[PDB]
Symmetry: C3
Subunit: 134 residues, 3 copies
């Protein structure tokens, strides 16, 4: 298997970023033909999702997250830190995605993209990558 | 590895369908004994989950989704299209699931089933399948 | 591949438990160096997530879940059983996680931990484990 990573500099507290490009980069630096790619982040207050990188939708995702997780809301973790909402967002969005690579083609749908979801920015974040296959 | 897919015709805007049968089908057409199966959909407005295929629960799942994602709600993606809620549902449900295959047995729990979650139907949808192992 | 499991005795209806220790245990009983570990639960009313095992945060996670899934709320599954909320929580948290093992190191972030999320306790639950690699 092959293994790699790249950084993602986020600019806002909540922000969705399309990192598909960097993933494919690494992936071609590996030249995998048939196998699985695992995209994952080692952060508990950031997540990764797969969906459409349409600007307005990306705004909606942040607002959707803000609504459900309540940044600054009545969370007991507030006694300890101020990012409770980010941890909560991470738990129902997820921190890793498995993506098949078939015949050299990263198996994403026509409108699917790899989105880094920052919930405690601005920070210099990391995305780790693992390729398992031929 | 082996690779396959099947279509799923959805009938309603929001609908949960049990597609366990078709997955096992393909899986036996492959005869995998020990390995991993990846069930994933290339759609950004549909998802896949694993849970109980009880009729009333399946209704509840749609209502749960409707409540959190607000179809037709105040989403900026509305300027572009009318399925913002579906994209949102997809992000916290997920578009792929990894399921171990051990000793020829698809490793699902007694009450676990593979559910296709349509949020922008009626459409002719696709489920892709990947088997990696011996 | 290697395969294993361990039980998790939950004490409350909703409860988050850090089971990282037991996973690493098994993992060393296997001595994997490079590969993937799949942590998954065969339950439809329990889930697994990866995040920080801070006590107050863990309380917040349960309250967050309680808020979104409404235990005892107006769910049609209520005609059949009383755990509708748990099924709902399971669908947007997930029942399996893939974790890379690189150079003998379980690839979790500094503050990431494997959390069992019980939503229909108290019960004697199971976590299944699969290691695929060298």
């Amino acid at each position: 298997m092959e293994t790699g990573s790249f950084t993602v500099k986020t600019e806002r507290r909540l922000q969705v970023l399309d990192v598909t490009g960097k993933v494919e980069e690494w992936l071609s630096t590996v030249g995998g033909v048939n196998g699985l790619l695992v995209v994952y982040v080692p952060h508990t207050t950031a997540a990764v999702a797969v969906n459409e990188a349409e600007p307005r939708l990306m705004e909606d995702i942040v607002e959707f997250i803000r609504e459900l997780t309540k940044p600054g809301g009545p969370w007991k973790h507030n006694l300890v830190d101020v990012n409770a909402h980010a941890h909560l967002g991470n738990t129902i969005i997820g921190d890793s995605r498995v993506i098949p690579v078939v015949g050299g083609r990263l198996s994403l749908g026509t409108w699917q993209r790899i989105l880094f979801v920052e919930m405690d920015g601005p920070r210099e974040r990391t995305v780790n990558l693992l390729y398992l296959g031929e």
